[PDB]
Design a protein around this ligand. Structure first.
Ligand SMILES: *[C@@H]1O[C@H](CO)[C@@H](O[C@@H]2O[C@H](CO)[C@@H](O[C@@H]3O[C@H](CO[C@H]4O[C@H](CO)[C@@H](O)[C@H](O)[C@@H]4O)[C@@H](O)[C@H](O)[C@@H]3O)[C@H](O)[C@H]2NC(C)=O)[C@H](O)[C@H]1NC(C)=O
Ligand SMILES: *[C@@H]1O[C@H](CO)[C@@H](O[C@@H]2O[C@H](CO)[C@@H](O[C@@H]3O[C@H](CO)[C@@H](O)[C@H](O)[C@@H]3O)[C@H](O)[C@H]2NC(C)=O)[C@H](O)[C@H]1NC(C)=O
Ligand SMILES: *[C@@H]1O[C@H](CO)[C@@H](O)[C@H](O)[C@H]1NC(C)=O
Lengths: 66, 50
């Protein structure tokens, strides 16, 4: 995973590719796993921006109540 | 996937770890495979507990 551009203009485009080659793509839910431990290196964030950072993410909880 | 501990206390913890390195963790659904063929070796259950 990598961050195209920086937060200088509040646009940190999150992409993923191979370590060797440049194959940009938005990170996907199927690409990752969940852990119960956290550290400073982990960027910290709220739930509402998860679809914003991961459009591939779908929050069934917050869509059903609508 | 292994069952650490036993059913002696009504708590069977299903965790997946690397065969090379014991790293217990609850498996993710995207990582399994669905099969049409069943044999006696598979654990029986109903859809409720999936
Ligand atoms: C979102 O999650 C991030 C984790 O991925 C958070 O990073 C953690 O940020 C908190 C504070 O925001 C840190 O906790 C602080 O630690 C300092 C360290 O104290 C030492 O240094 C001071 C100054 O030199 C000294 O006076 C002390 O005696 C200590 O020697 C504390 O002073 C603070 O009170 C506070 O506890 C965490 O350390 C940091 N994570 C890690 C793993 O270090 C991030 O902060 C979160 N988001 C927000 C907005 O906070
Ligand atoms: C999961 O379920 C299957 C099927 O419900 C279980 O296997 C079944 O076990 C029964 C009990 O022994 C078998 O019936 C018996 O078959 C023998 C012939 O092999 C016969 O002598 C007996 O009179 C009786 O009919 C059944 O054939 C067998 N079927 C299969 C597909 O395995 C299995 O034990 C269960 N396992 C778990 C972990 O829940
Ligand atoms: C999902 O969680 C929200 C609160 O976060 C709750 O209002 C809703 O009923 C939940 N829906 C389901 C299907 O769990």
């Amino acid at each position: 995973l990598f961050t195209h551009e920086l937060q200088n203009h509040t646009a940190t485009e999150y992409f993923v590719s191979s370590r060797r080659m440049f194959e940009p793509r938005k990170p996907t839910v199927s690409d990752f796993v969940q852990i119960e431990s956290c550290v400073v290196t982990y960027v910290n964030l709220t739930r509402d921006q998860l679809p914003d950072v991961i459009p591939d993410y779908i929050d069934v909880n917050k869509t059903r109540d609508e």
